Design a protein around this ligand. Sequence first.
Ligand SMILES: C[C@@H](OP(=O)(O)O)[C@H](NC(=O)CCCCCCS)C(=O)O
Ligand SMILES: O=S(=O)(O)CCS
Ligand SMILES: O=S(=O)(O)CCS
Ligand SMILES: [Cl-]
Ligand SMILES: [Cl-]
Ligand SMILES: [Cl-]
Ligand SMILES: [K+]
Ligand SMILES: [K+]
Ligand SMILES: [K+]
Ligand SMILES: [K+]
Ligand SMILES: [K+]
Ligand SMILES: [K+]
Ligand SMILES: [K+]
Ligand SMILES: [K+]
Ligand SMILES: [K+]
Ligand SMILES: [K+]
Ligand SMILES: [Mg+2]
Ligand code: NA
Ligand code: NA
Ligand code: NA
Ligand code: NA
Ligand code: NA
Ligand SMILES: [Xe]
Ligand SMILES: [Xe]
Ligand SMILES: [Xe]
Ligand SMILES: [Xe]
Ligand SMILES: [Xe]
Ligand SMILES: [Xe]
Ligand SMILES: [Xe]
Ligand SMILES: [Xe]
Ligand SMILES: [Xe]
Ligand SMILES: [Xe]
Lengths: 591, 593, 466, 52, 265
Amino acid sequence: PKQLFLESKNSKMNSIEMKYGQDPAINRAEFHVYGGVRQSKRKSEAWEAAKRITKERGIPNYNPDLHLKGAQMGQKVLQTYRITGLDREWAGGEDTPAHKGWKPGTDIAGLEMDDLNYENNPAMQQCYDDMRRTAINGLSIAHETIERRFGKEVTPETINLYFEMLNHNIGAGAIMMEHTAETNPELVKDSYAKCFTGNDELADALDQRFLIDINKMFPKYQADQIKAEVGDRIFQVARIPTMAVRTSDGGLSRAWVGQQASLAFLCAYDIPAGDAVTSDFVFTIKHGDVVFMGTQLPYRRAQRNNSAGGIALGYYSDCNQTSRTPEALEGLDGGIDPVKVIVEALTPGCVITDQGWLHNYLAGGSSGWSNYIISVYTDEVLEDYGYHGAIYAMDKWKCGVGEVPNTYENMMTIAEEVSRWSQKNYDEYPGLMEAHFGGSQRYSIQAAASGAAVGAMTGDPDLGNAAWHYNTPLCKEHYLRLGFYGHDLQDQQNMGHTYSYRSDQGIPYELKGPNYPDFAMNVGHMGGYIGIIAGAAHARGAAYSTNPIIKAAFADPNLQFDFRYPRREFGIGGLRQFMPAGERDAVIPPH
Amino acid sequence: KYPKQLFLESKNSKMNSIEMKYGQDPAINRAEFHVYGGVRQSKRKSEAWEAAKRITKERGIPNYNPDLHLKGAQMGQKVLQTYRITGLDREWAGGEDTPAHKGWKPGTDIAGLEMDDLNYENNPAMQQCYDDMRRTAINGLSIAHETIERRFGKEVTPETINLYFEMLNHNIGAGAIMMEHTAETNPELVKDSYAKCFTGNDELADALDQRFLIDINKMFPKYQADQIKAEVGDRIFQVARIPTMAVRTSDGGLSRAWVGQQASLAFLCAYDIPAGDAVTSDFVFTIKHGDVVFMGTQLPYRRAQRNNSAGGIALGYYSDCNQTSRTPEALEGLDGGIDPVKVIVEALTPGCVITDQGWLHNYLAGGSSGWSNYIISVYTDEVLEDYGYHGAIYAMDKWKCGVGEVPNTYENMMTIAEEVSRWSQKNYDEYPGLMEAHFGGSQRYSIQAAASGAAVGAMTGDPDLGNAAWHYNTPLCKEHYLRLGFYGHDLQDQQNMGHTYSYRSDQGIPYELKGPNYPDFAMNVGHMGGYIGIIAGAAHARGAAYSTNPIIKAAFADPNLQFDFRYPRREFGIGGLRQFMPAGERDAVIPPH
Amino acid sequence: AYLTEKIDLYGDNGKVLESDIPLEAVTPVQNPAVRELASIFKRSVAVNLGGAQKALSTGHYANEYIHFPDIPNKDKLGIKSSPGGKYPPKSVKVRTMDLPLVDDADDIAARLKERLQVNPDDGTEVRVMKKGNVLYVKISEQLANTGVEYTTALTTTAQAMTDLVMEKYDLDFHASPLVHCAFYGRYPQTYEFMGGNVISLLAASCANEGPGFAMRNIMANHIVAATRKRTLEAVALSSTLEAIGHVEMGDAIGRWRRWQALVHACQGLNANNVVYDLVKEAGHGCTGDVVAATVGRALEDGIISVKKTLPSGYKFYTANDPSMWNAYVCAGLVAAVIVNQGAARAAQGVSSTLLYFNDLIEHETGLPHAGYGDGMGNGVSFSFFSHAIYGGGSPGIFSGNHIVTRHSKGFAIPVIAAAVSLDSGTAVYGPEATSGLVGDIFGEVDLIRRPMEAIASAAAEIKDKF
Amino acid sequence: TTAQAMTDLVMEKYDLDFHASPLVHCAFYGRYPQTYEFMGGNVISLLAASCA
Amino acid sequence: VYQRQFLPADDRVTKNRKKVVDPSVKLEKIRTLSDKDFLTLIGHRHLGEAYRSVNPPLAEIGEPEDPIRELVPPTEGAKAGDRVCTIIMTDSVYNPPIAHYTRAWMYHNRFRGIDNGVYSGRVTLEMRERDLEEACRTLFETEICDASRDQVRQYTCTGHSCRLDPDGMMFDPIERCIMSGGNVVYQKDSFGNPVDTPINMGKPLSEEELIERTVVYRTDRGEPMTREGDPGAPDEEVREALQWSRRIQWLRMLGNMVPDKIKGM
Ligand SMILES: C[C@@H](OP(=O)(O)O)[C@H](NC(=O)CCCCCCS)C(=O)O
Ligand SMILES: O=S(=O)(O)CCS
Ligand SMILES: O=S(=O)(O)CCS
Ligand SMILES: [Cl-]
Ligand SMILES: [Cl-]
Ligand SMILES: [Cl-]
Ligand SMILES: [K+]
Ligand SMILES: [K+]
Ligand SMILES: [K+]
Ligand SMILES: [K+]
Ligand SMILES: [K+]
Ligand SMILES: [K+]
Ligand SMILES: [K+]
Ligand SMILES: [K+]
Ligand SMILES: [K+]
Ligand SMILES: [K+]
Ligand SMILES: [Mg+2]
Ligand code: NA
Ligand code: NA
Ligand code: NA
Ligand code: NA
Ligand code: NA
Ligand SMILES: [Xe]
Ligand SMILES: [Xe]
Ligand SMILES: [Xe]
Ligand SMILES: [Xe]
Ligand SMILES: [Xe]
Ligand SMILES: [Xe]
Ligand SMILES: [Xe]
Ligand SMILES: [Xe]
Ligand SMILES: [Xe]
Ligand SMILES: [Xe]
């Protein structure tokens, strides 16, 4: 039974061999014989488009012949990529707002690096936009103020009218005033509002078009856990237009919903224009009873709520919906598969924090640092290493996932074996060593596979992530090289900070994030931690890792991005088959 | 002694902007209500209703539904007025093709626009205007060149600068130069991204590849080019515009960081510097902090923002990024002489739309309306135009002088303000159709205050005194009508009657450097844009080429900008016609749709 | 309980300053000189009268090339300002004015001191420097401690200056915003008094990375400029500011208090002459020779001992005193930078020495390096962000509050101060470029320029209390 | 100082194992340092966070 | 003076690491380079050209009174005020006689006044120009430089992890380093610039020589750092590098929880 990177489980594709058309175990290659960028369909097409652009605007742009010392890019193979594990999927074939239904089990192979660049991939951009345009609030206080101050009864009928009105004004219309401007419905068709509740009788009394159905979206055991936390309360989940956050930031969401929800309360309950109660609605939405995807950031990297930088790792873990899919519930031979949850949750975890945030907010440029991150969700490499650690631990400790005692010693044992297996394959397959040519890719992958195995096997997220940092000596003392110049800042320091309680060192992994100082600057890490946190919770029988409200809030088929199968969605964007929201086609000239 | 009102007769096309809204004499105080079919009278809302039904069917959630309007009263119980862009019939230049549209034929009107066509949410011209401001990064290159010559040991010449710009234009949006196996961006998605430079040294300017130059001599009239070049001196300034699509995935604070990465790389590649040499850090530090000019400064925690958010843009920077100051209309539109009023009325258009719709609405509050009718009133139907020009003609006759020459005394400011307020009130009182068109008191109050400030600013050349005239309109307006504007409109008007010439900690500050973070202005619509116009006009009237920053003025004199900063009222109208093609769309990588 | 263990404080010449000092007597919570240093930073500001006068005169207010233009030759621009040129153009002057602030610096200083003074014998000081171009101001403890903030010297001086200039020259109403701009710059559109002419050694109070980081938001270039490049005095100032910062961060507490106090004593105050002795022994060598000297000194002092000998002959060492071992690694770290960057007289390699002195230490002993990961961690981040396109800058622009170098618990910034002090002028963003005024003005304060002797004398004054 | 003192004394008083370090820190500091505030923590001042 | 042990050396690989980093061990010269070819390969200055300076000579800059500074003699480059120049080398993952972290450890132990960065694909060394030239004699001419696996390249450095070419040479996108008549020659300088005549580096070492002298562990040749069955096994049953790695992790974790916890450990 070969490694998954040499033979995918069901399609039997050889992901590494397909890059070269040569046995990846052979240490031999011919260089300078590919015609440079001519071997790339996307860069060749880009060159021809660039010539037209230069002629039209009068300023040169993309020009591959500018490559240093006459050496065009492409002196070696510009490898293509295969999305990991698409041939092992069997569910999620429903049509989505972004594309017709994917046929589960169909692979996406031959993608070029530029197809998985955040700048060129609308699925990756929409993934982030869906997170930041979301506003979540408890409605108890607004209903309390209406009943106690205003004097009107709140019933399923008034809640339904409130949601019909909020869905009319959140993106397009006006209700109370004469002569008022409105937005073109075509530009905001992705904007809407819903609610969820732990009260099954209330859920059954509402118009289901406005309901996030916990009983439908989740398996029984997970629905029971979430409903027990939500209790007899109503939570609103509103998504403002993607186009609106694209003209500003995610901090607009709570303010925007503050305006529209206040108006829908005024109109659904006939409250006079200017009544003092109005201020309680906006205060409740913006501050009184609110859940944010991201918290504010300090002056150097100043941000209001809902920027990728303020999103706690556990919130990135819980907005992923792989935890409620059949693949994650019975993929490990009829049993729960926490590894499927880790490897999927780390895909937006890596792409959003590294490409969406570190790159598209803190640094930038035309590359999107794409090849660094592509390596974590393609060709079954990290997949093979992760499953290797799980199978090893299940056989050694004779138990299931989440049941290996969470001792420091067991963490070290598993980490040593996964590091060994990662190094064994990079050493025995020159073609794989060349595919993941950057040391950071190889270093992050052995550290992530080790953490995934420890997290999935012990159910302990801090211990799972401790295994990541222990890979620093294991990697360094073997190869005598690690990653890029500033890659091991956090790895070195977290070998000590993981179980430290000093002021800015101690903090559970669920609540760490891109503002934890050690993690604020470098790629190839945060996404891995995000996957580990999600998998550790999954392995110990939990429905989420950090916030049940976030988990329920993203169980929604009306989301533009499919949060259940992110690796697949990023591949669909790679095929140019993902239609994002926010485009301004309705009000611009033809093209 | 006053000419026929521009809102009743446009100067050249002779259109009656107020009458066209009703098909009835606007002086008659009579109207029939409840006879228009509600939203059925609106082309955009009627089309929106049909699109909504399709959207509801496709997604399974209802959306736009006009029948939800309170107590069975659909919107449209009165006329849902159309609008005419002010002064387009008085333009004679700016007919060049732009990246967003084929050349406008100067003097052509844009009339019959519906309110939804001038809603920031539906108008890509307005969105692109803001995006062009925030995606701009400006830097002096002296220190980067100094580090290469002293630290690295290589000579900087016009030839190395040209190669550096060719490389920066290759990597700012699309490609890689130094590394093997590197991802790149689709050129179609970033065709609006590029970098240029300008300098006060004419010999250096002539030695560079003109494709990378913002040519001060070609863009500005001689007297203005002389002033700008004297400030720039023998220095090179880089103006780089990162992709509109990139700021749309994050914020304007990305620009200095993005250019920090790409300019550093173009320096490494153009000068053959080893990968990892210590000098590399001086390039990114110079771009992000050492020698940089931002459109906007950072904001505090409650409204937290990195650089380049609309909230951090000083009023004077909004004034100077406007390019109406260098147009023939602003240079010879006043009977062969300079027309500071044309500058005020154009500079306040993006000033109002960006601060009120782009920022107060699209950042601090929100919703589906864009508060559009409030702000549409300041650049349509020649109403504010007539009031502003009234004050100028009145002052020129009274003081027997030209623009910028009325002594800047407090007594002179009060006299002009009283006359402009009087004229504004005379027209709103004598034309019921005009009173109904600007049905919100804030529109009428802001318009008399802005016209008064425009007249004082244009006639005295004093920006603080021009803006003092705005606040003096509060008693003049209130004691006449016994009503002002919306609930919280006069916070800043009341307090600035005292704060304008106060020097207390957070009260005193010149108007050029005030902005949306000056506490009095941080929350309310209908003001900041007016101040922005006044600042630009006061500088124009006293013979200046800019009001606050010569680098900002030169940085936006660029025909490759997606938005035409010379004629913003026209550009917003073109977006209203759905004829403005913005940058940042992702067509190249999305299904045929 | 008191940190009663005794240490000897040595000067930068390797001679004892004070003997038998309890560790407790050099801590920021007890030492009067260390406490006075923080008090000086809080209460001192500089008024740039020359800058204020020039901004008003030419209209180049604030920063970023801003210029409010006054045009004195309107009739020579070739434009008509009247319809049809009926009236000839006349120039106006509305954004600028000429005030003799520098010539009146002495009278202005007297008026500013009277406005800032709460009571006659309160300690308020105002000194005229640079022939009238700059005023050094130190407000009283009475005014400074009125409320809870550290910005009172900055806020009061800007307002007193603005008010007194308006009154002295009986300026008209038009002058109010312009004179306010001359001192405050872009405030309040900016939180900072951006481009203004009232300067504090502290950063704006909106800029901290966390609570208690104010004393850490001070660039290494400022420290080097204030100590005029005297290597160990720059190390002492940086280490002492980091020591105060760590107390304010809440990290000099409980089971971590001794560990934190020893970092300050051993690396910052040449306790027991360890720093000097290591540099003396290995000065003619490389970073590696400092590693050998550090391990040897730790063994000589009984701080570490052989734990186990592996079959190959390699010995694992054990820490008999873990907090003191960490402190000896911090001392060896600054010695290593002095030897390595001192040989090149070029600061850039400081980030490499920070990383590899610690990495060599672990490989040499089998004991953890400084900060159990932070020393190598910051060696990595600091190296990366001082030699790459991503951000950062030259060594001198970093501080305990910079995201790149904040992590280490007080032992990283002092090595940057040492390296930048030894630099021969190899950077463009060096102390003269970023901290000229800071060094010329605040460097005149003896306590800021030479803290070592002041801390030792103050520690000897209270040595019998513990 | 109170947040660190509480965290350290609780870790010492109950001789807690390494796993408790982040959790006990969270009990007093809340989301700090991912947040500047000791958000959702259990050490309260009458003053607001010093970033506000 | 305490005698350094440098690192655990229980086998051929770690003993090779110790030799490289121990400054008292002479690195054997295996090739001769003329002064003209040596300077041409570096590419910063040519033979007979005057050294450029970044600051005036040290004696003219007015160094302040500073007793500690007097204990550290400046290098000849520092005394002259030479520009700080960078040289970059890349070691293949395939059995090189020196690897990246060993370069940092060796540089910090053998050369004075350095700046150095370790990356997976390259290693920089930045010193005052004349000092850098002296250091490069060791980097280019001794046993730590196999011409086919340790190459000089200032940028476009990819190749460390790439498959070897048909001649066993490491890939170079700019083709600075080529195989001609069995010899490895530099047909362009470290910056990829033209050279008047190629710089001959001689023959590469044979495969068995490379395996004998390598500092890297490799699973394919049966010499991984962690062998099958080592995970979880007692310290005495694993490589000393793994016993050292486990110890550093235990002490960093316990020490950072409470420093006193590692006392006597
Ligand atoms: C370092 C710092 O930049 P400055 O040194 O402050 O210019 C910071 N940038 C970053 O952290 C860049 C992170 C992304 C680049 C590194 C990818 S490994 C920031 O923008 O606040
Ligand atoms: O070479 S560096 O490690 O500084 C950056 C890698 S993208
Ligand atoms: O009625 S209010 O003045 O509060 C709001 C007007 S949009
Ligand atoms: Cl300030
Ligand atoms: Cl500032
Ligand atoms: Cl707090
Ligand atoms: K070639
Ligand atoms: K539903
Ligand atoms: K009706
Ligand atoms: K002057
Ligand atoms: K004046
Ligand atoms: K007094
Ligand atoms: K300061
Ligand atoms: K201790
Ligand atoms: K509080
Ligand atoms: K063994
Ligand atoms: Mg389209
Ligand atoms: Na344990
Ligand atoms: Na041009
Ligand atoms: Na011209
Ligand atoms: Na007057
Ligand atoms: Na020769
Ligand atoms: Xe990166
Ligand atoms: Xe390590
Ligand atoms: Xe990962
Ligand atoms: Xe409003
Ligand atoms: Xe008033
Ligand atoms: Xe206005
Ligand atoms: Xe300082
Ligand atoms: Xe000590
Ligand atoms: Xe070489
Ligand atoms: Xe070995």
